[PDB]
Design a protein around this nucleic acid. Sequence first.
RNA 1: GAAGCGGCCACACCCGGCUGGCAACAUCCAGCUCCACUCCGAACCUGGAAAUUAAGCAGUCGCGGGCCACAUCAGUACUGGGCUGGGCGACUUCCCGGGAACGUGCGGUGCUUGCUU
RNA 2: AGCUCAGUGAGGACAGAAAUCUCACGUUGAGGAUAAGGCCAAAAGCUCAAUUUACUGUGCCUUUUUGUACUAGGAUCAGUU
RNA 3: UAGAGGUACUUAUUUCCAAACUUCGAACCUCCUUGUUAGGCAUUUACCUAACUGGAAAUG
Lengths: 164, 50, 195, 272, 158
Amino acid sequence: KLNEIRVAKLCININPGAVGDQVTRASRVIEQLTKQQAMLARSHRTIPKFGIRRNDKIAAYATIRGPKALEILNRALQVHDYEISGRCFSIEGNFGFGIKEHIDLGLKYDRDIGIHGMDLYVVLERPGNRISRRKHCQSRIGPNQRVKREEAKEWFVQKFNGTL
Amino acid sequence: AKRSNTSAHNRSHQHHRNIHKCVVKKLWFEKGMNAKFLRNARYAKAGQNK
Amino acid sequence: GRRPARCYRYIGNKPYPKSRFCRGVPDPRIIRYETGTKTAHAKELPICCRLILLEHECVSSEALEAARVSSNRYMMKTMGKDGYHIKINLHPFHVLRINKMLLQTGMRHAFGKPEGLVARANYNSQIMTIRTTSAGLKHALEALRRASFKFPGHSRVVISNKVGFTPYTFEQFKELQANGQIVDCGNHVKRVYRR
Amino acid sequence: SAKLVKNAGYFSRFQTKFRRRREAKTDYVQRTQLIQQDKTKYGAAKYRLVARITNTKVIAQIVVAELTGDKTVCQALSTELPKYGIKLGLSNYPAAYATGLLVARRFLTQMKLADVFKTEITDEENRRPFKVILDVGLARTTTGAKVFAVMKGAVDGGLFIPHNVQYYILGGAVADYMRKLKKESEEKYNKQFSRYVKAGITADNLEKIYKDAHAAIRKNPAATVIADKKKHAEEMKQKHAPKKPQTKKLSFEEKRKILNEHLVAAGLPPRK
Amino acid sequence: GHTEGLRHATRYLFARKFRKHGAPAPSITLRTFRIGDIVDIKVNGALHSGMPNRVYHGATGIVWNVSPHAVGILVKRRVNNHIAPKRIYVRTEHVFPSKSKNDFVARCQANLKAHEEAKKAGTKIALPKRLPAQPRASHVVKPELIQTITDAPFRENW
RNA sequence: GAAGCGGCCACACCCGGCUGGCAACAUCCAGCUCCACUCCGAACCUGGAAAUUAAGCAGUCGCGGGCCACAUCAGUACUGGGCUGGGCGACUUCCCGGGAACGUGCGGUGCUUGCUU
RNA sequence: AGCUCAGUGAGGACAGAAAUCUCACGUUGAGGAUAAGGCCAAAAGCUCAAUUUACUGUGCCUUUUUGUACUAGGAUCAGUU
RNA sequence: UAGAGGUACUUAUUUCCAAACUUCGAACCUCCUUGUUAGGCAUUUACCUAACUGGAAAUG
């Protein structure tokens, strides 16, 4: 029961590309979908090539927990027919995937806002990852509770009935 | 023009002709020390003689 | 050009390396320190033959490259790039200086610009080696006789007891190999400490 | 494959944090300014009310610092509160206040100053009160926290704790949250308040029980005067001894036996 | 280019040993001092408020003032000809109780232990005192391991 | 034996195995008020108690990394005095004193201050 | 009061050596106006919030007494925020 | 300096170094103590302590 893998969170971010009212529009893309008012990312560097200042709003991003994060993956992976690459998975057993052609997830009426593509990313963990997060009696989790890459792929086939 | 800048050859000789130990008069130094301590140390002495 | 090396033989200052502070330094005459069959073994070339210096003084970089070229060209002539392995065990890090002079302002602001690299030797420092087979031990001694006239002072040529460049005697080497304590790296001997 | 962080060169260089920084229980920047006293006061004690809240238990102490180590003068603990009235909810907000009254009134009856300092204090020709500081710890100091519940118990008990500041107090806010599950959801009332139903105290009773808890604490504060303490400490080892003993240390003889039997598989015996 | 700064030529004085960086333990602040007490000044390199000078590192003195965080220490610097007194103020985190007298105070109490207990039986007292390390009484020695040391023939070993 | 509070602050740290939960610590369950997320009850905060020792924690194991200790290393390196000692010099015998380091070998891997069931 | 940096490792629509997001290791190598050297990790760093102690008045101490000062710094007392 | 093992880097090694490198660390130096030390008693205080038949300090 407490060796169950679950979805800890599903962190979206949207970088439109280029500065201005594309970013505040991309907040409304998050807000209606996620039901959560979006955090606005600031840059760390001037890069003249991509059209970026040091202190300006690049992206929007938001962090989804509970049943809501599990719900969106069911609709999101149905774009790809429950299929992603095997090399999506990181060494901690966390994976992500692209949805260009926004509105797929995603149903909506575009008018003032444009369509904007999506960087989804999932975080698979056990129960007791409290202990790294907390203040009082903070410590490291065990080798056993740490999610391997190959166990995470077995979860993905078991959960969604998916294929690699 | 260019003569010597310094020397310490026979500093030691002169010092030892006489390193006299300058002795302190008393250990308390009432210019320093806490005023709040010394304030009370007056009222200890003043009350006693009466 | 150069000074005579009797100028810069004995050591009358602290050591003065190439760094942030020295700055305007020319690179040394040496590039290669090591020639012959470099990729060999302890077991393949057991016999070794050293050149030991019997003085406390500076050795120039120009001497060490003169000694390499005279060593190689004798060992190339006799046996012909197969057996031998030459190595040089000084690296010149000390930088020399000059007051220049070449009207003039002599002895005022006397500190001078670096002229060349040098190596500071110590009494019984080995400044060269030749590792080889028992066939060409004869040729190794005749090489290091010629290389000794390159160097300042006087300097003894010695056949070592110990194997290769390893610190192990021929008697000790069989006991450790047999014990299995020692192991072989690509080159030289790597001990096994059982930890 | 990139640089291995954690060489020998790392671990040889590595300074450790103290111990209770590693175990992550004390802030030592708090503690060094909690303890300190002016050198013109010399060897003088100042007391500090520790009030750390675990799950289930609300612990509360009064502590003096010394060079050997800290010394509790008096202690009180929310598993005592069944005796005075409060059977369940021993880390409630009103349970935290009730321990605050115990720590006050036990401490004052040990010092024999019970007739003085009855109520809160709020100034000359009068005996000065006990300075007792709050040690919070690593718990965060927000308003309506259970650390300052223990404080308000200690102030209303007797002790001058300095601060700048009766709902939540006689079981309110617990009692309202009972009604929201009882009225609407019903299923959730069985999850949330299982034990309460079992007694069953009910939503209404929470207000009543606490007032008579505060009566009984003020009347008969001190309890459980056991002696001698050595034979008490011996009984607790037997009483709470694991049924299964912990693995015990292999001696140096039998370690070298087991080392060699492993080395027989891979060769090159025996030694160490 | 000789400089007369406050913190000058103290690269290695105010360094913090090795694996003893950070703030000190809060047991240090709990310690107490009095007037007349012998104390040695050695510095915490971390704590910058209320240091001594570089010169009074490793320097014994006597306490004369005591103040909320800090102790007035009387210390005898050697000037040029003569040994001047110097009234320092310095914080308690650079100051420790010195064990200069603890040899002397051990003996006085050990003497009173002897001087009383001689009278308690009484009987009659032998007088103990300190004495430098003295040349030995005669005595007899049987060993039963006797090696024979000799110089070996020299061999180079390179 | 467990817990709050600590003292010296790695014999206590770091990687990886194994054996334990009567109470206790904890994971955990839930989100209404106190208040909390420059988004999120993840954290912080508050109210729980269904089931677990999988993790933390506790004890223990590894020809483990590191740390600590003793013995060798070594009367070596260096060094304070002395010579109308040697040596073109550079440096260095000897006489009266002091005396390392790295390395290797074997051992160890927290000892208990005051209160509580 | 809360948080941890530099960097390395793997990931992630357009995305590239460099944009924003995520987890893991991370003794401090980053950063702290600037020279160089110390010092610092639930901070002295970074972020957020409220603020004016960068305040008033006299002695004292250190650098430095084989030469007393000014500069700079330090421990207090008496106030007040 | 120069090979071997991994996926130009990197894990262990190796030849040989630093006045403005230090994880160890001498010799030679330097500073403090070595006669009065333990108490007990009760006056003084506007100071300190929650409190005084306490602390701190000086008077006997």
